[PDB]
Amino acid sequence: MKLSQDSSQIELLKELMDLQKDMVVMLLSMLEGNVVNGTIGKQMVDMLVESSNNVEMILKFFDMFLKLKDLTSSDTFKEYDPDGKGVISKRDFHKAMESHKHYTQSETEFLLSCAETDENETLDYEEFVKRFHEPAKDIGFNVA
Amino acid sequence: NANVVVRLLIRRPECFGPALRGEGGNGLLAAMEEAIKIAEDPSRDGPS
Amino acid sequence: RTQTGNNTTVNIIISTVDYLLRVQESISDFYWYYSGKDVIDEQGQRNFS
Amino acid sequence: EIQFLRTDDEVVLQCTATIHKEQQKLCLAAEGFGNRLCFLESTSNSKNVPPDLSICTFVLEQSLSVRALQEMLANHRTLLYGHAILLRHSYSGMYLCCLSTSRSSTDKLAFDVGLQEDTTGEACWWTIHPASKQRSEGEKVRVGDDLILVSVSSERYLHLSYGNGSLHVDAAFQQTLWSVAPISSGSEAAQGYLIGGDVLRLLHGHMDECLTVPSGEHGEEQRRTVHYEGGAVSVHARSLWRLETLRVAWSGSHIRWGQPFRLRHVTTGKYLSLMEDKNLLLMDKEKADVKSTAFTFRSSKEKLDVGVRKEVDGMGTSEIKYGDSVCYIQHVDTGLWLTYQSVDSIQRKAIMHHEGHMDDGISLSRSQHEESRTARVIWSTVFLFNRFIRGLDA
Amino acid sequence: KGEAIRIRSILRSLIPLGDLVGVISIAFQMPTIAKDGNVVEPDMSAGF
């Protein structure tokens, strides 16, 4: 939640997500070769319920960008931003947030804060998505 | 440095001395008054 | 994990997770240090890396 | 498998002494009303003198990490070593703290340890440190372990003052080992079942006569007698009785059939007991002996006993039910059963008998926390005012 | 800063102000001219 907002911490964010991927890989090597109703599974479920809130927050964090990619792929985004350079205004981006109707006000404002803009009060969705959606894909797949 | 030093000094209260024992200590003032008396007495100040 | 032949056995497997516990404690403490500050400096960024 | 100390679990702070070459077990205690100063109550002499764990039990609210708590102060979790804890006294509702005041007793650097209403300040929080060398900072906190507590504000360890003839809890640089014993777990507790330390009324039969002492007549000679009275006597501090188990550790466990206990009158401060001539008589804490005072419940009037059983080190099964379950009072050794004399507001004497009645079964009703606290306040105030009046008369 | 504040609290607890006042209240001895004409010196390495 903190590194994403600042533009100068993207490299550290990527390193962190690589660490996340490695830890989930180890957690799956835990379950490799597990019987039904195994003590390993019981202990990991206990771990998850102990750390429930953090898991929820991580899942919501991933789901933001998972829905962001779908919104970008949606045709309403193109009808709001017909041009090819793709530098949408922040104002148009916000009205697209509420036109999507899948994004609450909190998610909209968090994406506003995480988004980086030039002096023209405008952001580029291509830069935004390549920065955030693709890194989340494989770690989210590992968690799933 | 000062924080660490004062924490060690208070953790080992015996570093202060008989005046600042806290238990049965005559106090710093009384300690220096008795030390002055040691100074006047030759047998108590000197090796003798 | 088990040195069957040797008289004394040492659990490198357990010691590795002990070191992982210590390093995660250090990382959590360093996070709590950089919790108040708005932006992380380059020194802290390299230490995190 | 191994139990770990957790937040919101009711515990007691325990310390051991070395007075005249023996280990004396002393629990930390404090009274909410009146003075806030903490004292120690002897628990080694549990057979001769009943320990009053009611003011000794404590509840852990939060266990924050040190620097996160620092950020707090600038602005069921399992206990972990190196964490400052917030201890809330169960009865009073106030929090243990370092008073920063000194009695000028044996140490001028020492600060008295008492109870503070407000949560603000570093005095309320207490860091836990591992006194055992096997334990290290960052290890899990066992239920059975020796701990040393350091005040966050004064940086003074929780200390026991051997220097004074009367042992005192104090905040000093010197250490003292404190062992934490779990009394009960709030989450594990089940509603409607008897637990240790609960205040209850011994309402009897359909006539709903409660076992009580006579009305306040300024005479302990009248008050020491016990009888069955019915009517408005139900809602009063006289009818309140509190159950204290002989076992100190895990005293808040579910009470089971055939488990000895001590019934205490909260208002008078006296303990129910038995004379040799087979009558019930209230009699003092100091001279209240284990054999006479101890009573037990049985599921049936049927005479054969459950013998001896294993005492669980936990919450245990919840057998006795408030209201639904029917209980029978019986002495621990003589096996006599509580009986009414059938003397013809009702004023029937509570007698003790070899066989008893057919109709000696009794029911239990849980007392409200407000009424229990009020009754304790009444007792703790009447004691102080009685000693005040005696001093003025002298 | 709470750390510095509690450090000052610890220092004040260790040293009462009265002892400091009394030590300053203590006075030392005056080297004096003698009958012959020599000023007698108390030891610099002994006494106040």
Within 8 A by CB and 6+ apart from D85, the residues are D60, D62, D63, D79, D125, D126, D127, D128
Structure-determination technique: cryo-EM
Resolution number, Å: 3.5
Contact check, Cβ <8 Å, D163/B23: yes
User: Chains near C, with 3+ CB pairs < 8 A?
Assistant: A, D
What number of CA atoms fall less than 13 Å from residue D254's CA on the CB side? 19
Name beta bridge partners: D365: D201
> What single-letter DSSP state applies at residue D234?
G
b (16+ CB within 10 A) / e for D39-65: bbbebbeeeebbbbbbbbbbbbebbbe
Neighbours of D96 (CB within 10 A): 27
Contact check, Cβ <8 Å, B10/D106: no
Residues after which chain E has a gap (C–N > 2.5 Å):
none
Nearest to D197 by CA among D267, D258, D248: D248
Q: What is the gyration radius of the CA atoms in chain A, in angstroms?
A: 18
Within 8 A by CB and 6+ apart from D258, the residues are D296, D297, D298, D305, D306, D309
Nearest to D239 by CA among D53, D367, D373: D367
Q: Do B and E have ≥3 inter-chain CB pairs under 8 A? A: yes
Length of chain D as a residue count: 394
Nearest CA in chain D to B21: D107
What number of CA atoms fall less than 13 Å from residue D143's CA on the CB side? 18
Q: What angle do CA D56, D59, D61 make, to 5 degrees?
A: 155
Give CA–CA dist A19/A16, Å, rounded. Answer: 5
Residue E16 at interface with chain D, using a CB cutoff of 8 Å:
yes
Taking the CA of residue B43 and the nearest CA in chain D, the distance in Å comes to: 32
Two structure tokens written together for D154 = 């004064």
Give CA–CA dist A104/A94, Å, rounded. Answer: 11
Give CA–CA dist D39/D166, Å, rounded. Answer: 10
Give CA–CA dist D226/D263, Å, rounded. Answer: 13
Residue C13 at interface with chain A, using a CB cutoff of 8 Å:
no
Nearest to A80 by CA among A66, A69, A67, A94: A94
Contact check, Cβ <8 Å, C45/A6: no
Element (H, E) at A64: helix A52-73
Task: Report chain B's terminal Cα–Cα distance, integer Å.
Answer: 42
Option in B6, B29, B45 nearest E7 (CB): B6
Nearest to D102 by CA among D118, D91, D113: D113
Contact check, Cβ <8 Å, E6/D154: yes
Contact check, Cβ <8 Å, C45/A12: yes
Give CA–CA dist D44/D25, Å, rounded. Answer: 5
Contact check, Cβ <8 Å, D109/E14: yes
User: Chains near D, with 3+ CB pairs < 8 A?
Assistant: B, C, E
Residue C49 at interface with chain A, using a CB cutoff of 8 Å:
yes
Q: Give phi and psi for D321, each to the nearest 5.
A: -115, 135
Give CA–CA dist A72/A70, Å, rounded. Answer: 5
Within 8 A by CB and 6+ apart from D328, the residues are D297, D298, D299, D300, D301, D337, D338, D360, D361, D362
Map tokens 């991933």 to a residue: A62
Under 8 Å between Cβ of D48 and D24: no
Residue E46 at interface with chain B, using a CB cutoff of 8 Å:
yes
Element (H, E) at A10: helix A10-31
What number of CA atoms fall less than 13 Å from residue D300's CA on the CB side? 5
Taking the CA of residue C6 and the nearest CA in chain A, the distance in Å comes to: 28
